[PDB]
Design a protein around this nucleic acid. Sequence first.
DNA 1: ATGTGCAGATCTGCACAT
DNA 2: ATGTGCAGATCTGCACAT
Lengths: 230, 230
Amino acid sequence: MQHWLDKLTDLAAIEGDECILKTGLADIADHFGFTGYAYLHIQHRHITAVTNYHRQWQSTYFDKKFEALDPVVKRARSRKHIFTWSGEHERPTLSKDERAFYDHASDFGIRSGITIPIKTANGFMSMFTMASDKPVIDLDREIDAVAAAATIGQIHARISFLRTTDAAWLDPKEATYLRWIAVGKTMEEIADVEGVKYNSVRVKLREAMKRFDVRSKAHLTALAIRRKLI
Amino acid sequence: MQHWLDKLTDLAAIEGDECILKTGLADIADHFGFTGYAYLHIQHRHITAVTNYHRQWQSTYFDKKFEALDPVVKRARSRKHIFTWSGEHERPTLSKDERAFYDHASDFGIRSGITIPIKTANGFMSMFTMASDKPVIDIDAVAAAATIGQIHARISFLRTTPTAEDAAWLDPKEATYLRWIAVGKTMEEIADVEGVKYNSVRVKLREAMKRFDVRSKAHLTALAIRRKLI
DNA sequence: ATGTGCAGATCTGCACAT
DNA sequence: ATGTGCAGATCTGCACAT
Ligand SMILES: CCCCCC(=O)CC(=O)N[C@H]1CCOC1=O
Ligand SMILES: CCCCCC(=O)CC(=O)N[C@H]1CCOC1=O
C-alpha cells in the first residue's frame, strides 16, 4: 500500500469536520503500526493540537507544560526539516527531567517517532508526528524531506480550515475510497492501494450507496460531488 | 522585510472570498517584481490554472496546447523539487517549437522563473511558479514545498474556480446520456427512455470515454461534473 | 461517424454466518 | 453489526463493418 505520507495527502482533501478528520488520521497511523499521531500548531507558547496520543498523556502533557521540556518540540523549533527521535538512542546525550519525561511518555507507547516541522503563517509553526512504541525507527529508505514538507503543509492547511472556513459527511473510508472510484480505480485496485481487503472497499461503498439509495457508483459519485461531499 | 514564500505562507491562511485570494496572489508577485505567478494542477490530461499571467498567454497556451510543449511543465512532471528556468540558457539545449514557445512567451514578460512542483491527492500534482522578465534569475526546497502545500490546500480545498483550463467538451447527445448515467440509469434503461438503440447510447458514451481517456462511467461523470461540462 | 458482436471484467443485489 | 460467497446484471475492450 502507498506510504503514509501519500495517505495523509489523500486525507487532507476530504470533508468535513474535526471528528471525521481525526478518525481518518488515527486510521492511517494505525495502519502503519503507530501508537498514534500528533499534530501541533504552536504560536510562541499557546498551542493547538489534534492528536491520538492517550487522553491521559495529553492531560499531563499540558498540565505540566511538557511543551517546553519536550526535546522533539525543541528540535522542531530549531529546524523545519523532517527528523526521527528515539528517547532510548537519545538517552545518553543530555537529559535529567528530559530523561524522566521520555519515561513517563513510554507508559503510553510513545518511545520513538517521525516528526515533520513546518514553518506556518505569521511566523508560527506546525509539526506532525507519527509516534512509535518501538525503541527506535529503522527505515529501509529515508523519507523525502521535500515530500514530507509538502504533505504536512497540506494537512496543516486542511486542519486550519476546520476553524476558519449536508453535514452528512461520508466517513474517511467512504470518502477516500469514493475519491478513487471518481478517478477510475476499480475496487480491487483501491484495495491494492489502501492495503485493505477487497471486501472492505466492497462493503464500505455498497453501504454508502444504500445510504443514499442509488444503484451505481456513477450515481454515488455524481451525487457525492454535487453535494460537495467529496 | 520578507521573502515571497513567507508572504505566500501567510496568504495561505487568508479568508476567504475567491477574488480576495487571487488578488492576494497577484499582490505578492507584484510586490516582488514578477511579471506574474502561475498555479497549475495537473490531473489527468485535465489541467486547471489560476494565473496572473497575461489574459492572452492564458487563452492561447491552452488553445495551442502548450501543456505538452512548455519545457517547464515537462520538467515539473519528472521533478518535484524547486527549480529555476531561464528560457535563454535553455535555448542552446533542445528546442524545436520549444524555441518558438519561449519567444512567444517572451511577448508577455515571461522570460525566466522559479517553479515548485508538489504531489497532491490521488497521485496528481500541482506546481507553483513565479515569472520574471529578466533574462535569467539568481532557496530551501523543503521550505518551498511546505509553502506550496499550504497554497495548494488553500486554492484546491476551497473549490476556487480556475482562471483557465485545457478546453474539453461534451456534445448534446453525450451530455444527455451522461446526465442519465449520473442518476444511476443503466445504458439499456437510457436507450429505452430516450427511445433509441442500446448501441447508440453505448457507442456515444463509449466514444466520450475514449476522448477523455477514462476507464469507467463514474470517472467520466466525475470529470464532466467537475469541469462543469454538465 | 456509427454500429455489430462478444468475451471477459467488474458491479450489484441477496442470503447468511461472523 | 460486518465480512463472505455468489450469480445474474452491466459494462469495458477489441475486432470488424458501414
Ligand atoms: C498532548 C499531545 C502531545 C503532543 C506531543 C507531541 O507533539 C509529539 C512529540 O513529539 N512528543 C513526544 C516525545 C516523547 O513523548 C511525546 O509526547
Ligand atoms: C494558462 C497560463 C499557463 C501557465 C502555465 C505555467 O506554469 C507557466 C510557466 O511556468 N512556464 C512559462 C515558461 C515560458 O512561458 C510559460 O508559460
